[PDB]
Symmetry: C3
Subunit: 337 residues, 3 copies
């Protein structure tokens, strides 16, 4: 332990431990499985692994509930940098391994999300739980890509959850700089595993993809994230037509050319639990965003399947559904059928 020269080199996840499972890949503007069928990610976020462990809720039964009773085919894991450091990489990766085995057994997929909020080029963030560096972010993806080489269960590497400069208080937002840094991460990933799908985000908290109309990331096999929460678009008159136009302008257009995953979406009533901008809505957003995504073939993972973090999909750890939880549960179950 004091003999640092005898610390072992890292090992890769044992692919023989898994049951057969299709790889998902990008083909044009769609995801497809390795049988050639169009595939749509449909599922939920759960909380950070460390948060779940802290209350003894990191267990296979959580994934079983979701796969069997909520219609999901995907779970997004929002890996918070502060938690990565607190558990440490070795321990955190040991718990991701569990998630891989649990998901594989149920035939569902994982999105691994490096869950920071802020501006990576200046290393300034919305809150210290998101604090990271370029060096730590690169090392996270280097470790992940090596460990989960050739693992179909781990489908998407979501490089940096929510880019934002908070009105340029964190730095001067610059698309060219952000594009170049994403390309750099993708190059490190693809040097280690070409079968994984990188997921890239725009500014305004992963809401604004409009820069990619003329400056998309110059790499193959990638998809784009979107976080179309209810109050991100602000039409004077609230109806389907006006939201659809604003969504089209900022993010929806991307689905015409590339696959898109709405890796966060959801709402709570303005006087409901943990209500805050931009997630406040009277509920009309639910049918509206689902209709929009269904029309464009957009994939999604609702935020969040947790009783503490808001907007919640459940009210307690017996999985009593919240308003949005009841709504999306029915949507996902119907889509699965």
């Amino acid at each position: 332990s004091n003999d640092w020269w005898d610390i072992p080199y890292p090992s890769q996840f044992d692919v023989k431990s898994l049951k057969t499972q299709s790889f998902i890949s990008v083909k044009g503007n769609k995801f497809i499985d390795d049988k050639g069928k169009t595939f749509t990610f449909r599922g939920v976020n759960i909380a950070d692994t460390g948060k779940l462990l802290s209350r003894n809720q990191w267990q296979k039964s959580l994934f079983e509930e979701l796969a069997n009773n909520w219609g999901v085919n995907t779970i997004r894991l929002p890996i918070h940098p502060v938690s990565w450091r607190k558990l440490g990489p070795d321990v955190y990766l040991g718990h991701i391994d569990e998630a891989v085995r649990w998901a594989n057994d149920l035939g569902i997929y994982l999105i691994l999300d490096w869950h920071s909020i802020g501006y990576l080029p200046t290393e300034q963030y919305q809150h210290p739980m998101y604090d990271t560096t370029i060096k730590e972010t690169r090392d996270f993806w280097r470790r992940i890509t090596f460990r989960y080489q050739n693992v179909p269960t781990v489908a998407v590497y979501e490089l940096f959850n929510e880019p934002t400069t908070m009105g340029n208080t964190l730095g001067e937002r610059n698309w060219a700089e952000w594009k170049t840094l994403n390309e750099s991460l993708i190059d490190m990933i693809y040097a280690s595993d070409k079968t994984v799908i990188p997921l890239v985000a725009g500014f305004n908290w992963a809401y604004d993809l409009s820069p990619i109309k003329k400056a998309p990331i110059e790499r193959e096999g990638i998809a784009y994230a979107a976080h179309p929460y209810p109050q991100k678009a602000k039409p004077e008159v609230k109806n389907d037509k006006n939201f659809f136009k604003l969504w089209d302008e900022k993010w929806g257009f991307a689905a015409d050319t590339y696959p898109v995953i709405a890796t966060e979406l959801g709402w709570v009533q303005p006087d409901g639990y943990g209500a805050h901008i931009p997630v406040k809505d009277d509920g009309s957003y639910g049918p509206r965003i689902v209709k929009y995504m269904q029309k464009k073939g957009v994939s999604y993972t609702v935020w969040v399947f947790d009783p503490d973090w808001s907007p919640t999909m459940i009210n307690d750890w017996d999985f009593t559904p919240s308003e949005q939880g009841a709504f999306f549960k029915q949507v996902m179950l119907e889509a699965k059928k």
Copy 2:
């Protein structure tokens, strides 16, 4: 252990203050918000942590200075090692005290990120000054948010003393340093446009000459100068020869921009803590005062502390040193017409 419950930060309560004029930049001068030309005239005190450690961080210190030494400004040299040691939350809690004390006395603060070295390569004169670009940005992000709309906090002195120590710390490069200052100013102005950023040149904040051809391309800023006695080295020591050399390296700036000499002072060559560049027989005192008075230059003498040299006081009963007695009389006279 629940990192997700760590609170978001709060802003200083502007209602806690009595009415106080804002200071702003207009052309080559500072003005108050009544439109009258304003000159910062005061002293440095030691780092907050040093003062706390000996029970000298107290309102009575500010009272002594305002009532008995003629000051209208105190410069707080916030040393990065001390920022880390107390931690941001605690250190900011103490800056809050200084704000309330200064406001009650009608005096102003210069907040100085007190490092010595070359930020672009993150190499420094001594570990007490050790920082990074990331930490420096974060300091200014936190400060600007917390003291938004606070008139008492007048000046944000971005980086005390740039130097490469004969290029041992890096290759001095004005373009690179200019760009980094512009980056910090942008972050600050995104959060509070009413504050005055203060920018320094090389040779330990002595050499402003690069701004003749390449000034910082932002409005509402001022430039620092640290014209210690031995920075200029004329063969023949007299007013004329020092004035010429001063003019060439820093004084010329005051023709176009406001300048604050945020450090100046001397001790006898055989006096307490004597070191280059602060050694002088005393003829410097009248000389630098005459020079600044002719150019309208603002200043804060280094240092109102009995341990750090050159001292203005010999003990915590405020027994004046040689330079202390001299500047005390100058400031008292300037305060009354």
Copy 3:
């Protein structure tokens, strides 16, 4: 102890503690001593200081064995970043001081090697024992250069042991970027001590110098490293001619214009102790690499005079020679006489 303002400024090695010793310098494509005679470094690596200390093998008797019985005029010290942090700079430098005194007393020289493996520009590495940052690497060279100013015993500063991107998994290898960074380090070093010899490495684990044909480091007085282990070149037919041609193309050509030190080389049988790519050979490599270097006037330090780290030169701490150890011992003893 809590008073950070009283932490001392650093001191320099006391040159009066040394006996008279020639300085080595660069002249054209050769090293010369300060008598003007062509000089060739010929010796060995030993293990990291912390590893040796841990087993009570950091002792003058080690250097005595090598100088008196193995024909060496040089020892390379591979200072591992993790060990630098574990001992701490002050303590590690105190032990380098011992090595300086021991080497000086024996009339031999030291190569100080910042022993990392990976890609410094992205701060990604082969293993955590090598983990560093640009900031830490600069600080290492800043401290070293100041401390060993005007010390002839310390001849070479090997800036970064083994540049590699491990098939671009660590970053996109880019010569211009790496060149520029080495130039930056050299400038900081030369600002502090112009008498030292910087040693610069290429990609593919310090094997590929070919980028210097067009784009050499644009500074005077430097030498280039090479690590020509047996399996770095892979000719279909294994003989002198074919290895010489491949070696010429990738690194040997450099010796026509600049001095070269092969700061690692060696082999073990493919079924021998700690055998791994690229150090496996049947033994024919020994005479071959020696003949090649002798023809080109190339300097060298064999890896490694340690019984634990492979390929070993000794089987135990009584200095029983391994196969390669017996071979190089005879070569060095003959070259010395």
